[PDB]
Amino acid sequence: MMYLTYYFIEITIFLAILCTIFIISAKNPMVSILYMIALFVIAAMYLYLIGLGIFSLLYIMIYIGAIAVLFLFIITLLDINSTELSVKSNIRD
Amino acid sequence: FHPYNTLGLATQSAMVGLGAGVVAAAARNSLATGPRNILTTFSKSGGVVTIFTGASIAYVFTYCSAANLRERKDGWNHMWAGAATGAVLGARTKLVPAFIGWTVLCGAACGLFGWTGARFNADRKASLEQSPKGFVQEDAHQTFWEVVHRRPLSLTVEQLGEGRGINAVPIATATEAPN
Numbered sequence: 001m002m003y004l005t006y007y008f009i010e011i012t013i014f015l016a017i018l019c020t021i022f023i024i025s026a027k028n029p030m031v032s033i034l035y036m037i038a039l040f041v042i043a044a045m046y047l048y049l050i051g052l053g054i055f056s057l058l059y060i061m062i063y064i065g066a067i068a069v070l071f072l073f074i075i076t077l078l079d080i081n082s083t084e085l086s087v088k089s090n091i092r093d
Numbered sequence: 094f095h096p097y098n099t100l101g102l103a104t105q106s107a108m109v110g111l112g113a114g115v116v117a118a119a120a121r122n123s124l125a126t127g128p129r130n131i132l133t134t135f136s137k138s139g140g141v142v143t144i145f146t147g148a149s150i151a152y153v154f155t156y157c158s159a160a161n162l163r164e165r166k167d168g169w170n171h172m173w174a175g176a177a178t179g180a181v182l183g184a185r186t187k188l189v190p191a192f193i194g195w196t197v198l199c200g201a202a203c204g205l206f207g208w209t210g211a212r213f214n215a216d217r218k219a220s221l222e223q224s225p226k227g228f229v230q231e232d233a234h235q236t237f238w239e240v241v242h243r244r245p246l247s248l249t250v251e252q253l254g255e256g257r258g259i260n261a262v263p264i265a266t267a268t269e270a271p272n
């Protein structure tokens with residue numbers, strides 16, 4: 001039972017890599033913003049893990065509560081065309 | 094001096110130039126305009142890999158060779174290395190006078206770079222600020238940045254050589270009647 005919660009920092013690192021890849025990869029930028037929100041949740045988790053839950057809640061109420069809201073606010077109101085992630089366009093990188 | 098290991102340094106040279114050419118080819122592939130893929134990094138690169146590798150091998154090989162032939166460490170070795178590197182960069186243009194000009198001019202440029210110390214930086218213990226300066230005090234040997242009111246005549250005669258006016262004894266005292 002003791003070490004069931006040992007690798008909860010490594011899991012957050014893994015999930016952060018995943019959410020960044022999904023940000024880069026998502027077709028609609030609304031989905032990229034949602035994955036940025038998930039990355040903020042993961043960071044807030046990690047901050048609770050290392051003993052800074054005050055910063056976790058500050059992040060939840062500032063980043064997710066205002067900045068992500070404003071991102072959604074602008075993409076709901078502005079035409080932001082997008083090229084989908086492609087192999088004929090991005091494989092050169 | 095201490096001899097240079099030519100082939101080892103030149104092998105390191107070639108690997109470094111190869112890595113740099115790969116990095117430049119990737120940068121060109123990503124910065125370019127037309128349709129491109131992971132195929133074109135070596136197909137459409139303008140000889141960047143060969144530029145880097147040839148320049149690196151030529152410079153280091155020629156530098157260490159001239160240092161081992163001349164048995165010295167000085168800026169003329171950088172002159173020769175620049176001559177060789179310019180010859181490589183000028184053989185690309187398939188013309189004789191451009192090749193000669195590239196060789197001669199980059200030889201002169203890298204030789205100036207070596208003449209000045211072979212460094213874009215400073216030595217910082219040979220600079221004027223950190224070195225003993227001003228007038229030298231009591232018969233001491235004048236260093237590079239020091240100043241002297243009156244110099245030794247043996248030193249003059251050795252540095253310059255006898256003849257053409259400059260003699261180990263003044264003329265008037267040397268021709269003074271022993272009276």
Ligand SMILES: CCCCCCCCCCCCCCCCCC(=O)OC[C@H](COP(=O)(O)OCCN)OC(=O)CCCCCCCCCCCCCCCCC
Binds near residue numbers: 115117118121
């Ligand atoms: C992979 C294995 C690795 C192995 C380990 C060892 C590897 C060593 C790697 C060394 C670094 C190599 C980097 C190569 C340069 C970057 C690639 C490049 O192309 O730079 C120029 C870049 C694009 O240029 P491009 O799009 O191709 O079009 C050119 C048309 N004019 O456009 C740019 O503006 C980017 C410029 C980057 C420049 C960096 C700073 C260079 C400093 C210049 C030195 C000048 C000093 C000489 C002074 C002499 C004075 C006369």
Ligand SMILES: CCCCCCCCCCCCO[C@H]1O[C@H](CO)[C@@H](O[C@H]2O[C@@H](CO)[C@H](O)[C@H](O)[C@@H]2O)[C@H](O)[C@H]1O
Binds near residue numbers: 205207209211
């Ligand atoms: C575009 C036209 C170009 C023409 C102009 C040419 C001017 C170039 C400056 C030439 C003078 C440079 O002066 C040069 O002198 C001394 C020798 O006297 C060199 O000698 C010094 O070299 C360095 C590098 O090893 C070390 O400190 C070494 O111990 C030595 O003391 C210096 O590296 C350099 O400073």
Ligand SMILES: CCCCCCCCCCCCO[C@H]1O[C@H](CO)[C@@H](O[C@H]2O[C@@H](CO)[C@H](O)[C@H](O)[C@@H]2O)[C@H](O)[C@H]1O
Binds near residue numbers: 218236
């Ligand atoms: C176009 C003209 C203007 C060119 C611009 C550059 C001007 C300045 C000339 C470069 C000065 C180089 O000077 C540098 O090299 C001389 C040797 O020659 C060194 O002088 C030192 O040489 C060592 C030998 O290595 C001896 O012990 C010597 O007694 C002295 O201490 C100093 O480390 C430094 O003073």
